[model samples]
Target: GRPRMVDVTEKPETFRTATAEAFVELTEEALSALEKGGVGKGDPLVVAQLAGILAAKKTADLIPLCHPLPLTGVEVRVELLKAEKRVRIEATVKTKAETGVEMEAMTACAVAALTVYDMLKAASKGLVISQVRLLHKAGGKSGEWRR
Candidate 1:
């Protein structure tokens, strides 16, 4: 079979949304420094948010076999999951295009988590990136799915 891209131009506009989550474990020292607002790398959360959003927008260009859809929205939320002692990142991407945006959202989440590791690696060389998984997706022919 030949590889072909799905054409979304003929499909009706519909609201589409997808969510992905990631977690990164940090050392006690790194967590403590972050809590005290003493991390010398500026704001890790802010930078990660912007990075995830940019990743979502650049999905088509970065990943092969992806269509360049006009993303209506991209949001990445990151916070320290105190109980788990890890930085939790969540990316939600929305679009009204015919195709789904799950991949874009997942990429955003993964990139955000990776960015956190990159920024905090100096403080916590043992940082571990985990749980970078898709949570939910909607507005596609296959309907909605949850993990």
Candidate 2:
């Protein structure tokens, strides 16, 4: 067996967008340390945001069989969803290409979460990375999908 590419030559052009989310859990000590301006590696959220957006744009080069589509937009948001104890990462990718950018969005979010872990490892070696998955996707002959 071998890989196959979905021929999009006949596919109609349409806007494509994808959303993804990830979560990182920190221990109480680590959370409080962050609140008190005490992380050894500096701002984790900010670094993750930049990395996520960059990763989204670089997806074409990273993923095999993915057409290098010019992305229209890439946005990444990180917030303390649970009283600064847990961080939630969201990555949204948009393009007007024939194929969807779901994988790019998902990879961006996952790598973002991992980046957060890397930054905060000094503060809390026990940091937990979880819930890295796609939230939605649209465009192409496959239609739209959401979770």
Candidate 3:
């Protein structure tokens, strides 16, 4: 098949949830600036959280294969780890649809991390975004999974 949407018609609509995490490593100076809200980019952590939530709703549009889910809720947590010199982001997405919300959660995580980088880019150019992973998923034929 060149490209096609999945036949979710056979599947019943059910409550689904997915959780994902991502990290953005920053330089010591940049981290310090972020810790004190000195970057002046409109609070990176807060903006990242909002960005993640917004990104979750746009997942299907961003990725062609993803189904347009009926999102029930979305939660994004952005934590600044001063000692680690990195920003940790966790995104959870809920949906009542035939498929799981894993893609949305992961997309949210990655986009949030990217936004963090963008917000603090002026402070430093050596920011590293990594460790994007799906932590948990529930509902669907697979039932549940965690990692």
Candidate 4:
């Protein structure tokens, strides 16, 4: 990758927010273990939620060429869907910066999904993390987008 950081110094500061999501597919046995409490590392969903928030703050560090933004808010929500046998992670990031926090949101979701897998691997290593995506973004010159 020809890495180049975009210069947003001249861009006006505005309220920006983004929401990202990821799905962690798990075996029924692993899912049951999480529901009961956890497999080995306490509650995986709770730990994953916190990990996601931490990841959002460290997004710039994790991914090079990303601007270090002053994030105003970060929320990580993890839900276990028994019918789908999946853990759904959603991250919402907010900032009053020149650029959008899409990357931060996505990073949070991804890390949270990974954390879930890590915490539950002892129960079953066949877990799959997938479908990480930016669902919505708001503010900035390019404007809002949703999918």
Candidate 5:
């Protein structure tokens, strides 16, 4: 009835996993610059990957309403889509907990995309971060969902 953290004490722990993705639209020139690796700040691809994983672990701190979860695994992939002129980010998070991991997975994706933009801005100021969405999630009462 009021704003509060969901009471999950009585919820049974279940194996949960979630996958999410985000995209950064880039120009050919910017992608070319990324291929050289490290925009002086560091390798954006690897940096973003690491940022996503680290950010996933801190979801509770950032989101406020989120519960700090014990993550079993986190995998983040940062790929340069040369043909499409874009940067693709995918994050998958796994845990054994009462709640689904959709927020953790999505938080990773969103943060990773932001890092990509931060690292690539020097190459192109017009970059756009878009299409952040949950791809799949399973466990809890919902069982499974995919998009």
Candidate 6:
């Protein structure tokens, strides 16, 4: 079942912040190519960051159950783990709304991870995007949650 809009009208607004993370496992060739000068398409990390931020802002549109929230801040960090041949993506979102921003943060990380896979596929077709989950959330009726 679904509500018309999840009906946040009765909920009290509060400052909310959330963080999510995703990992993109890369191949040796993909890592080397990324370090050299990005893939033929463009810089994977930079593009992924941009894509993540954009996705965070558009989470409500993407997820039917989510409310359109006015986010106060958004951050996306992309890190390369050469030893593990993976890219770690972290996204944080802050907002003053009736609902928490966990969905926004998770969406950002997931989109960024997908972007990394798309950009690096030319270099290595065996890339895997995994471990997308909410790491932390704060400010809401629930107070805080971390994992």
Q: Give lDDT: candidate 4, residue 25.
A: 95
lDDT of 1 by residue, 24-56 (tens): 887898788767653688777778878999999
* Candidate 4 residue runs with Cα over 4 Å from true position: none
Scored by TM-score, the top model is 4
Q: What local lDDT does model 2 show for residue 23?
A: 91
Model 3 — which ten-residue stretch has the worst lDDT?
A: 33-42
| Shift in Å, residue 86, candidate 2 | 1.2
lDDT values, one for every candidate: 0.85, 0.84, 0.90, 0.94, 0.91, 0.92
lDDT of 2 at 4: 69
Q: Rank the candidates by lDDT, best first.
A: 4, 6, 5, 3, 1, 2
Per-residue lDDT for 32 in model 2?
74
User: Candidate 5, overall lDDT?
Assistant: 0.91
**TM-score for candidate 2, residues paired by index:** 0.89
Q: Per-residue alpha-carbon lDDT of model 3 for 61-147, expressed as tens digits?
A: 999998887889999999988778888999999978888899999999999999999889888989999999999999979889999
Model 6, range 1-147, lDDT digits (tens) per residue? 546777789998888999999999988899999998688898899999999999998998999889887889999999998888899999999988888999999999999999998999898888999999999999988799999
RMSD of each: 1.9, 1.8, 1.1, 1.0, 1.3, 1.1
**lDDT by residue (tens digit), candidate 4, 1-147:** 676999998888999999999999989889889888998678999999999999999999999888998999999999999898999999999999888899999999999999999999998999999999999999978898999
Task: Show model 3 residue runs off by greater than 4 Å.
Answer: none
Residue 44, model 3: Cα distance from true site in angstroms: 0.6
Clash pairs detected, candidate 2: none
Which candidate's lDDT is highest? 4
- Report the number of clashing residue pairs per model: 0, 0, 0, 0, 0, 0
